[PDB]
Every structure is written in C-alpha cells, then in structure tokens.
C-alpha cells in the first residue's frame, strides 16, 4: 502492498 | 474504536526544538501509515510526513525534511514528531492523521485533537 | 506537490438554500488501482477537520444525506442541497491518490439571516 496513504498499489 | 490523543499545548524557545506524541489506538498501528499535518493559525492544511510503525519507513516533504523527525514506538502504539530549530513558522497546530479508505466495512478518517506550539522567548 | 483550488472562497446563503462548492487539480486524482481519492472535509472553529465525503461521492458515517458529492478526473464538485446553521464552517476538499496528501484553501460557508 500500500501507498504512504495507505491505498492498495 | 479508533482514537488520536496527542500531547498538550507547548511554549518554545526559538532556536529550540520540541518533541510531540500521538497515541493510537482501535486499528492495527503497524499495518497503515500515519500522517502528521500542520495547521498554521491561517486556515490551511499541509502534510508534513507519515511514518510505518511497523518498519519504522518515514516521508517527509522537501521542506519540513530539516525540520522534522518521525519516530514510533510500536510496543507503545505512540508516534513522535519532533520539530527541530524552532522559528516564528513553526507557531501552528499539528495533528495526526489516519486515513484509509480501501475496504468498505472499514473506512478510517481520524485526527488528533491538536498539539498547539507557541514559539516565543 | 497536486494543487486544489476551491471556489468560491466565501459563500453566503440563507437557510434552506443550496450552495455548491468546485474543487479542481492541478493533476487527475486516478489511482493507478482505479480508485479516485478525492475526499471532502468541515473544519468546525477550534476543532480538527472532519470527514464528509470520501472517494469523491461516498458519505462518511453520521454525515446528513444533504451533502452530495460529484466529479470526475480533474473537476469535483460538493452539494448541500439544504443549509442549516450546522453546516457553519469551512469545507475543504483533499486528495491523497497521490503524495502529498494536499488540500484546498477552503470554502467559508457565511449564513444570512
């Protein structure tokens, strides 16, 4: 898995 | 569930450096980033970084990179931001952020109260 | 750095009216994982902000069924479709498919009575 905001990558 | 509690107002001396905490708690503290934003009194809102508790991976923007350090205590749930040679900028309101948004029947938008800093002599 | 630029700044209405805010990027707010991260927040005084909408049209809990949201690729837009003297804060609208999070420079809702 996830970005520095936490979304799925 | 789920609760940012921050620590108290602070005075600094310019030139100092304080040190603030941001206790977590209803979610898994070393599975997501958290973020820490900085309100200057003059309404806007800007990012400053976020940390992974679990392996301890800061983000800082360009600016705040000399003039920040993220830090976690994970057996602790509790983050540290530290903001090095104060000035009259760093008077803001910080807060702590947890954000996410990809499963449904777990949606998380939590703030911290607050850490308001005051740099005066 | 993705810039949010809001407008109107300043937003006078009566109660019972409808007010709309426009929140645009400097770049597209697709994720590569198809989801658009456009979120929008009510700052009320002395408190943090809070979330109203997130994932351009979704309604965070609590939040009244009088607040809309729309947008696509670059241009968002926010709907009270009633205002109340509840509403009394500023709106901002965020975005965080890309780093950094970033936010506008907010929306003062000014009632008239």
């Known amino acids: 898995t996830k970005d520095t905001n936490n979304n799925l990558c | 569930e789920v609760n940012l509690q921050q620590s108290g107002t602070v005075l600094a001396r310019p030139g100092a450096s304080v040190r603030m905490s941001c206790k977590a708690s209803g979610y898994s503290f070393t599975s997501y980033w958290l973020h820490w934003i900085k309100q200057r009194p003059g309404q806007g809102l800007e990012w400053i970084g976020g940390?992974?508790?679990?392996?301890?991976?800061?983000r800082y923007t360009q600016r705040f990179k000399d003039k920040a350090k993220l830090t976690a205590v994970t057996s602790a749930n509790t983050a540290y931001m530290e903001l090095s040679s104060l000035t009259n900028e760093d008077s803001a309101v910080y807060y702590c952020?947890?954000?996410?948004?990809?499963?449904?029947?777990?949606?998380?938008?939590?703030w911290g109260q607050g850490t308001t800093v005051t740099v005066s002599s | 750095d993705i810039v949010m630029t809001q407008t109107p700044l300043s937003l006078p209405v009566s109660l019972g009216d409808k007010a709309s805010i426009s929140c645009r990027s400097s770049?597209?707010?697709?994720?590569?994982?198809?989801?658009?991260?456009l979120h929008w927040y009510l700052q009320k005084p002395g408190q943090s902000p809070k979330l109203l909408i997130y994932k351009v049209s979704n309604r965070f809990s609590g939040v009244p069924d009088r607040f809309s949201g729309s947008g696509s690729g670059t241009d968002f837009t926010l709907k009270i479709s009633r205002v109340e003297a509840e509403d009394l804060g500023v709106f901002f609208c965020s975005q965080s498919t890309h780093v950094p999070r970033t936010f506008g420079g907010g929306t003062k809702l000014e009632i008239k009575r």
């Open positions: 952020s947890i954000i996410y948004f990809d499963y449904a029947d777990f949606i998380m938008d939590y």
């Open positions: 770049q597209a707010l697709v994720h590569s994982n198809g989801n658009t991260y």
């Open positions: 940390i992974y508790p679990g392996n301890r991976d800061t």
